Amino acid sequence: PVERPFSDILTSIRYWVIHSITVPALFIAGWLFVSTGLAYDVFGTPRPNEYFTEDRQEAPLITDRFNALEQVKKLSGN
Amino acid sequence: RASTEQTTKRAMLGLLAGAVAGALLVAPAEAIRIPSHEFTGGMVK
Amino acid sequence: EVNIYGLTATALFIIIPTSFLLILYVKTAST
Amino acid sequence: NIELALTLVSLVLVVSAGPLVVVLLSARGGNL
Amino acid sequence: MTSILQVALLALIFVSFALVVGVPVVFATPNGWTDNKGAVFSGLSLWLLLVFVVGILNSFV
Amino acid sequence: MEALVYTFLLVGTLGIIFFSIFFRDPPRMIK
Amino acid sequence: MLTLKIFVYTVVTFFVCLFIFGFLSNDPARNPGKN
Amino acid sequence: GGRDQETTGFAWWSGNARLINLSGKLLGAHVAHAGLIVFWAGAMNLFEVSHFVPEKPMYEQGLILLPHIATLGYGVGPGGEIIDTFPYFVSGVLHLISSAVLGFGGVYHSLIGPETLEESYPFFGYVWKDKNKMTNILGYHLIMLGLGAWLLVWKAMYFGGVYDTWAPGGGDVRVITNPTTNAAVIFGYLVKSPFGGDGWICSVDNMEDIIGGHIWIGTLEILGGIWHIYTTPWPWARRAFVWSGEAYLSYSLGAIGVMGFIACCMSWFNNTAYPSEFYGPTGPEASQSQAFTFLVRDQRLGAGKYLMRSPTGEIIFGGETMRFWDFRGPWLEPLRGPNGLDLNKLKNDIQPWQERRAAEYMTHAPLGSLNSVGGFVSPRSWLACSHFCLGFFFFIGHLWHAGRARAAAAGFEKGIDRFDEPVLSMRPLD
Amino acid sequence: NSSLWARFCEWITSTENRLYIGWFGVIMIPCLLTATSVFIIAFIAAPPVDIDGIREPVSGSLLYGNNIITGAVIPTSNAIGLHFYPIWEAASLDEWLYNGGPYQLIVCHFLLGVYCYMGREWELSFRLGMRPWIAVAYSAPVAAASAVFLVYPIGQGSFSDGMPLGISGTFNFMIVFQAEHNILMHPFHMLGVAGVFGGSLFSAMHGSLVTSSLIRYNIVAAHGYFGRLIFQYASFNNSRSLHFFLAAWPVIGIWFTALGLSTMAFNLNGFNFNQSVVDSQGRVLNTWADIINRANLGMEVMHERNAHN
Amino acid sequence: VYPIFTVRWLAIHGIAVPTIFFLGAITAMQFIQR
Amino acid sequence: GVLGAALLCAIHGATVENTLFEDGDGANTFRAFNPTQAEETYSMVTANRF
Amino acid sequence: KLPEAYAPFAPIVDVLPVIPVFFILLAFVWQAAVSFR
Numbered sequence A: 001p002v003e004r005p006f007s008d009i010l011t012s013i014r015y016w017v018i019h020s021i022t023v024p025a026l027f028i029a030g031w032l033f034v035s036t037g038l039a040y041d042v043f044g045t046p047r048p049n050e051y052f053t054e055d056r057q058e059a060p061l062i063t064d065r066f067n068a069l070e071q072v073k074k075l076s077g078n
Numbered sequence B: 001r002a003s004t005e006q007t008t009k010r011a012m013l014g015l016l017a018g019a020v021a022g023a024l025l026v027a028p029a030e031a032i033r034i035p036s037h038e039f040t041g042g043m044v045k
Numbered sequence C: 001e002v003n004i005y006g007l008t009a010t011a012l013f014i015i016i017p018t019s020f021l022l023i024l025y026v027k028t029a030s031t
Numbered sequence D: 001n002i003e004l005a006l007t008l009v010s011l012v013l014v015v016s017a018g019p020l021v022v023v024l025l026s027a028r029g030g031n032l
Numbered sequence E: 001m002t003s004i005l006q007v008a009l010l011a012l013i014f015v016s017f018a019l020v021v022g023v024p025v026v027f028a029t030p031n032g033w034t035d036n037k038g039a040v041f042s043g044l045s046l047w048l049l050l051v052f053v054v055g056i057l058n059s060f061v
Numbered sequence F: 001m002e003a004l005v006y007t008f009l010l011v012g013t014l015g016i017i018f019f020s021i022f023f024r025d026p027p028r029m030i031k
Numbered sequence G: 001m002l003t004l005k006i007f008v009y010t011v012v013t014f015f016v017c018l019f020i021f022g023f024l025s026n027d028p029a030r031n032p033g034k035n
Numbered sequence H: 001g002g003r004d005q006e007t008t009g010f011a012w013w014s015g016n017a018r019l020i021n022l023s024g025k026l027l028g029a030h031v032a033h034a035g036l037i038v039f040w041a042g043a044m045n046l047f048e049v050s051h052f053v054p055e056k057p058m059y060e061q062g063l064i065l066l067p068h069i070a071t072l073g074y075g076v077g078p079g080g081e082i083i084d085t086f087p088y089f090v091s092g093v094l095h096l097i098s099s100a101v102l103g104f105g106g107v108y109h110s111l112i113g114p115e116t117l118e119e120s121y122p123f124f125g126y127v128w129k130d131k132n133k134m135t136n137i138l139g140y141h142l143i144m145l146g147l148g149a150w151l152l153v154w155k156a157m158y159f160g161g162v163y164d165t166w167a168p169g170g171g172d173v174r175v176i177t178n179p180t181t182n183a184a185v186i187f188g189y190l191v192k193s194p195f196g197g198d199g200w201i202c203s204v205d206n207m208e209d210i211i212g213g214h215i216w217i218g219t220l221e222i223l224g225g226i227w228h229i230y231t232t233p234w235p236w237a238r239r240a241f242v243w244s245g246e247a248y249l250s251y252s253l254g255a256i257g258v259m260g261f262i263a264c265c266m267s268w269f270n271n272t273a274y275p276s277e278f279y280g281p282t283g284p285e286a287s288q289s290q291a292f293t294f295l296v297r298d299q300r301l302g303a304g305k306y307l308m309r310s311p312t313g314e315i316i317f318g319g320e321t322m323r324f325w326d327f328r329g330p331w332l333e334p335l336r337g338p339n340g341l342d343l344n345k346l347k348n349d350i351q352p353w354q355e356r357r358a359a360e361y362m363t364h365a366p367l368g369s370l371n372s373v374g375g376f377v378s379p380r381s382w383l384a385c386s387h388f389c390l391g392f393f394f395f396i397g398h399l400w401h402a403g404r405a406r407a408a409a410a411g412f413e414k415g416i417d418r419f420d421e422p423v424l425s426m427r428p429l430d
Numbered sequence I: 001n002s003s004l005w006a007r008f009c010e011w012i013t014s015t016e017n018r019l020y021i022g023w024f025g026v027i028m029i030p031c032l033l034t035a036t037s038v039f040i041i042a043f044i045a046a047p048p049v050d051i052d053g054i055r056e057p058v059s060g061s062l063l064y065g066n067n068i069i070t071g072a073v074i075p076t077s078n079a080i081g082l083h084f085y086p087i088w089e090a091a092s093l094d095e096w097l098y099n100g101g102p103y104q105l106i107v108c109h110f111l112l113g114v115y116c117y118m119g120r121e122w123e124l125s126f127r128l129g130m131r132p133w134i135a136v137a138y139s140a141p142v143a144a145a146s147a148v149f150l151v152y153p154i155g156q157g158s159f160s161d162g163m164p165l166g167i168s169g170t171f172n173f174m175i176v177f178q179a180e181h182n183i184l185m186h187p188f189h190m191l192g193v194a195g196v197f198g199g200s201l202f203s204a205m206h207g208s209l210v211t212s213s214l215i216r217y218n219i220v221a222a223h224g225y226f227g228r229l230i231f232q233y234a235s236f237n238n239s240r241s242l243h244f245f246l247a248a249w250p251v252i253g254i255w256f257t258a259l260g261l262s263t264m265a266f267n268l269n270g271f272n273f274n275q276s277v278v279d280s281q282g283r284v285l286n287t288w289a290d291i292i293n294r295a296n297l298g299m300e301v302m303h304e305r306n307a308h309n
Numbered sequence J: 001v002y003p004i005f006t007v008r009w010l011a012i013h014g015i016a017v018p019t020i021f022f023l024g025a026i027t028a029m030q031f032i033q034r
Numbered sequence K: 001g002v003l004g005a006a007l008l009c010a011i012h013g014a015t016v017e018n019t020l021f022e023d024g025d026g027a028n029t030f031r032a033f034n035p036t037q038a039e040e041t042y043s044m045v046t047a048n049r050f
Numbered sequence L: 001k002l003p004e005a006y007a008p009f010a011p012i013v014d015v016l017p018v019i020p021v022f023f024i025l026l027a028f029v030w031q032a033a034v035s036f037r
């Protein structure tokens, strides 16, 4: 009912035990998220060898609103 | 082609990141909070 | 005499607020 | 890549050379 | 004779590191300066002599 | 004509500044 | 114009000398504190 | 150990202010700082030596300390060609060892030595209010500075000489046999205007003038030290200044800031004490070299070109570079007649080395970037920027410390009394 | 005590004058009065000035077809460079006007006047028992003006690169300066922008809290509002630390931006990220830095005349 | 003093967990030959 | 507006910090103040006259 | 590139210039070791 101070948790053992094993899990999760290439697929960021398609040799252009989904699918090469 | 070329540095950096983050997040919060207890502990509203 | 309307606008904008402020100051200073 | 490893080792040793004095004084009850 | 000069210079690096870590520790420690004057002076003399011998060895390389 | 208007406006601003500096109401409220 | 140059030099020298001799006339002793 | 805020009244962020009245601790601090300065000197000299390629010029690889050693004529031949890089190594090593000695001394005086030196060492003890001991210290250090200047003169005259960049056929190491000690020439620079064409002190263009000026400075400094050791300030001096540690600090701050600004300008403009083939070309030099190279190439190809008349009536390079018509350099003086550039010599009196040097300076103008990408930052740019910033900050420091010292002497460095406000004792409606 | 010199000193240093004079005053007042007189006279009736030195004069006076926004005092001709150009050194008064001497006169007198203003701030603070560090605060605008008017022309090499004493002149100076040096990406201009914006923020918020607190408590009642509004409990609990922070933020910001301008005068540069991202095969992928570079290149191509007759 | 999963806990974690995740992602990005 | 706001901030801070009342023996003026003060910590009269 | 005799000691030199920048930091640490008294 008094919202325990931060000093008490700092000296606690359960807090350190949980965090020393959980924070590295998040760090490795992010490292693997970027390394395995899942970031490119999820966020649509092209890989350094996919910026320019075989048929396209210039920056893409949407030039279409209600069919923008198909336009982006075609431009991205997928 | 884009792919990480370092294998084991990930864990070594993660351990240090977590160890530093714990302390660095608990301490300033303590410093800011103690005055919050002082102010809201008898003279508030 | 170039831009007669511009001159009129400038003169009015300088006179009306100035006259208003001076009138208010004189009216209050009598107190 | 021995050169980079040796440079890092030297940098770490030099960096630790400073706080070591403070830690020794604090543990031995010096007048720091 | 580059090897002798190099090993002497590495020994100088180590001696200087030990001297640096020790001298402030000796000075700040209460009642420590007068207790360990001899050791500090011996270390300083060793440092100077090793500098000089390294210089001579360089003069011969 | 524009030059005269600009000069008059600038002179008026300078005169207002001078009057505010020297003919101000005395600050006895706190002094 | 030699006359203009001489006049400006005279004025500047007069002002600078006035300033220098002003700060040499025991400046630090004229303050509202007593010390 | 250290003091506390309650005992001294100065917080941790003002901690060193607690050393004002502790002679031994202050001396230890100063000695340690000098040791640190020499440490940086030696470490940087070794670092630059370890990253130095003698084939390439110094200004193409970001070296700022090596040029200083080279200018004195150490391991340099005609045309600024490096013969050996041992002198630089020995300089760095000696600086580092002296740094070790000074650091030990400073640490000892700061931790073990007596806090106050005026109890058991009367000669070295002092109190800021004393107007004789402080003058004695001033005289000792003036003697030291004059001795250093005379040491430079001795090197320039009897220990191999210095690197003269105005020697015929490019610069080279030469010995100044007859430095100019004429009073009019030496002191003419001091009263020279600081504007374009004049160059108050940055216009010194020959090594003879530099060596003569150093002779004069050494003699004057030694004489002033002797005079100060055997003299006490006059009453007007005692009434004009403030005699306290912070006042002396403020005076030093002002002088050193002015010195920093002068160094900024000297590095940016001068190319006699800062020869181009070590520090690179000045901006005016780069523009003039570009114009000269273009004119030479156009004349050689056959298809003057760009030569206008200065406001005074001389003949100068035309275009956007007409602003830099006061530039004088070793590779351009032979082509200059009584009134500006001479058409005949500019036409058929150009030697290959002058053209090569102009072409080299053309592509290395001070144009650069903080990112260090290119129009590449010239060492002159780094020196000028850094020392201008330092001079400005030290002028600000002079303002701060002078104000504080005067206020503390007056007796109100902590605030208004609240019982006798001086303002309340003045006529109203100021 | 009754000597004429003593009476003059007493009058100069007297605190009973409506405006304090002091010795810094006796130096500045003629300087600033000369500067303002020449500035007004030239702004109203100065003839065109050959800024670029290519016999293409630039008009900047009200009589010669200008208004308040577009008027200015054109800097000295590029032909003069850094040369000292007083009236007595010009061949005739008309030539002195043509080359642009009034700018040099005004700038020199103004710089001396502002320095002596900084001095007399301290002088009056000393004669009144105040602490002496308002001159330190004023040193920031003084440093910036000194940079813009004297240090940039020194590094560049001509007074024609100084800021014209005008409004559209100021905008032209900024646009050219961005074209040449890319100020926007320099960390010091970023610090200056941060200082200005943060100073505005802190002024507004300090005024808000103090006005709210002042009733018919100044720091103990308002601190309850700010401690929980944006957290930061016991951030500035002292009326002294808070006001020192107010004084320190903008002053340091402006010091840094002035130093950045001076360094650009000696021409290092702002950052430069042109072509910093490349894909495989070496093709260049544009970033916003590249678009900024295109704008800078356009500005630069317009600034240079090259072909001058 | 005893209860956990308070508003403070959620406020801290909501900005702490993604921060560590993104730091890991950026550190991984650093080691890309490109 | 923005530049004047910066000017006001700087001037107000400098004036308040340089007209403080001497209510502390120590050379540091930050500890010579507590939030429960009665009178203001700077002299308005002196700043106004300056 | 340093005399060949000292060639192997190249890396350590590459750390010497930055050491002074550490001393100031050390001071703070020392102060942090005395609770900023």
Ligand code: CLA
Pocket: H027, H031, H101, H102, H104, H105, H106, H108, H109, H113, H114, H117, H121, H124
């Ligand atoms: C600014 C520099 C400086 C100053 C003012 C002092 C001053 C002092 N030191 Mg410190 N010291 C310094 C640097 C300095 N030292 C350095 C760099 C080191 C490390 C090597 C030391 C190491 C040190 C120790 C270990 C001790 C002192 C001690 C002392 C005190 C006694 C002096 C002494 O031994 O008489 C010697 C007097 C001499 C005149 C001989 C000096 C020999 C020099 C090299 C010759 C030149 C001196 C000459 C006067 C100058 C000629 C000028 C000429 C060219 C024109 C005195 C307060 C002693 C003390 O009591 O502790 C406080 C002590 O035990 N010092």
Ligand code: CLA
Pocket: D018, D021, D022, D025, D031, D032, E019, E020, E023, E024, E028, H001, H002, H003, H004, H011, H012, H013, H014, H015, H016, H018, H019, H022, H025, H026, H028, H029, H030, H032, H033, H100, H103, H104, H107, H110, H111, L023, L024, L026, L027, L028, L030, L031
């Ligand atoms: C180069 C800058 C410099 C220098 C020379 C000094 C020097 C000094 N300070 Mg100052 N100080 C500085 C920066 C500096 N300080 C800064 C930046 C701060 C703010 C963070 C302070 C804050 C401060 C306070 C608050 C106080 C001092 C005090 C002192 C004195 C006592 C030494 C000490 O720390 O206590 C003893 C500390 C120790 C024994 C721990 C440090 C151990 C060693 C010396 C570390 C370095 C070792 C070195 C690497 C070895 C060299 C090798 C060589 C021997 C061969 C001494 C004269 C104190 C004093 O005397 O005031 C009256 C004091 O109260 N200083």
Ligand code: CLA
Pocket: H023, H026, H027, H030, H031, H034, H035, H102, H117, H123, H124, H125, H126, H137, H140, H141, H144, H145, H147, H148, H151
């Ligand atoms: C005998 C009196 C005396 C003498 C000679 C000195 C000498 C010196 N003091 Mg001072 N000092 C004194 C008394 C004295 N002090 C007193 C009483 C105090 C108060 C306690 C101090 C406090 C003090 C402080 C606080 C500091 C000094 C420092 C220094 C040194 C700085 C040199 C330097 O870089 O400046 C300019 C000089 C040079 C750059 C070098 C010039 C060239 C040298 C001197 C030539 C060497 C000899 C030459 C090769 C041969 C000439 C032959 C000829 C005789 C024919 C210098 C050795 C400073 C330092 O760093 O000390 C380590 C420093 O910070 N002193």
Ligand code: CLA
Pocket: H138, H142, H190, H191, H220, H221, H223, H224, H225, H227, H228, H231, H232, H233, H234, H237
């Ligand atoms: C580190 C250098 C140094 C320092 C700090 C001092 C400090 C001092 N000296 Mg010493 N002195 C020195 C070097 C130094 N001196 C040298 C090298 C010499 C030999 C030439 C002398 C010869 C000397 C004598 C003969 C006397 C002093 C006196 C003094 C004291 C008064 C300050 C003063 O001279 O008036 C400061 C300056 C003025 C009061 C007036 C300056 C006004 C002019 C118009 C300013 C412009 C200068 C110049 C013309 C401008 C052009 C140059 C410019 C481009 C830089 C003071 C303690 C006096 C004293 O108290 O007796 C011990 C004294 O009688 N000194």
Ligand code: CLA
Pocket: H010, H012, H013, H014, H015, H016, H017, H249, H253, H389, H390, H393, H394, H395, H396, H397, H398, H400, H401, H404
């Ligand atoms: C040799 C020159 C010198 C000397 C001996 C002193 C000595 C002193 N000063 Mg002064 N000062 C100087 C130069 C000098 N100062 C300059 C050039 C400035 C202008 C900035 C100042 C501004 C200044 C102020 C405003 C104050 C002092 C104070 C003090 C005292 C305490 C030291 C301190 O601040 O705590 C130790 C210092 C720190 C913990 C600060 C370290 C962090 C700094 C600010 C940044 C680190 C440098 C950074 C990387 C470089 C950025 C700039 C870069 C572009 C060059 C002491 C008496 C204080 C005092 O009590 O006065 C009585 C005080 O209030 N000084």
Ligand SMILES: CC1=C(/C=C/C(C)=C/C=C/C(C)=C/C=C/C=C(C)/C=C/C=C(C)/C=C/C2=C(C)CCCC2(C)C)C(C)(C)CCC1
Pocket: D014, D015, D017, D018, D019, E013, E014, E016, E017, E018, E020, L012, L016, L019, L022, L023, L025, L026, L028, L029, L032
């Ligand atoms: C060269 C060499 C040597 C020596 C060296 C030395 C002597 C060095 C020193 C060094 C030093 C002496 C160093 C130091 C360092 C320090 C540091 C590095 C620190 C850091 C810190 C920090 C980082 C902090 C932070 C913080 C604080 C302040 C607290 C609070 C929180 C925070 C986090 C903010 C010899 C001769 C032996 C040999 C060879 C090598």
Ligand SMILES: CC1=C(/C=C/C(C)=C/C=C/C(C)=C/C=C/C=C(C)/C=C/C=C(C)/C=C/C2=C(C)CCCC2(C)C)C(C)(C)CCC1
Pocket: E051, E052, E054, E055, E056, E058, E059, H089, H090, H093, H094, H097, H098, H099, H101, H102
């Ligand atoms: C490696 C090398 C070498 C050699 C080296 C050596 C041999 C070194 C040494 C070094 C040394 C051996 C150093 C030393 C230093 C010292 C010092 C630096 C000192 C100082 C001192 C002082 C400063 C003092 C002062 C004082 C006193 C004491 C008292 C009176 C007062 C006074 C203050 C004056 C060779 C050539 C082979 C090779 C190359 C390099």
Ligand SMILES: CC1=C(/C=C/C(C)=C/C=C/C(C)=C/C=C/C=C(C)/C=C/C=C(C)/C=C/C2=C(C)CCCC2(C)C)C(C)(C)CCC1
Pocket: E009, E012, E013, E016, E020, H032, H033, H035, H036, H039, H046, H093, H096, H097, H099, H100, H101, H102, H103, H104, H106, H107, H110, L006, L009, L012, L013, L023, L024, L026, L027, L030
């Ligand atoms: C008090 C204190 C402080 C400060 C202090 C100081 C600043 C000191 C300094 C010191 C010093 C300043 C020292 C020095 C030392 C040095 C040494 C010890 C050296 C060594 C050397 C060596 C070892 C070398 C080696 C080598 C060479 C010869 C070259 C190349 C090769 C090799 C690398 C092998 C502070 C404020 C932080 C805080 C408080 C405490």
Ligand SMILES: CC1=C(/C=C/C(C)=C/C=C/C(C)=C/C=C/C=C(C)/C=C/C=C(C)/C=C/C2=C(C)CCCC2(C)C)C(C)(C)CCC1
Pocket: G020, G023, G024, H185, H186, H187, H189, H190, H201, H204, H209, H210, H211, H212, H213, H214, H216, H217, H240
């Ligand atoms: C090396 C050289 C040379 C020469 C040099 C010389 C010769 C120098 C000299 C120098 C000198 C000889 C300097 C002097 C300076 C001085 C001064 C800087 C002063 C100042 C003062 C003052 C600032 C004051 C103030 C005051 C006031 C206003 C307040 C009241 C009081 C009195 C008056 C104190 C030559 C060119 C050949 C070569 C190259 C360079």
Ligand SMILES: [Fe+2]
Pocket: I206, I210, I243, K012, K016
């Ligand atoms: Fe306020």
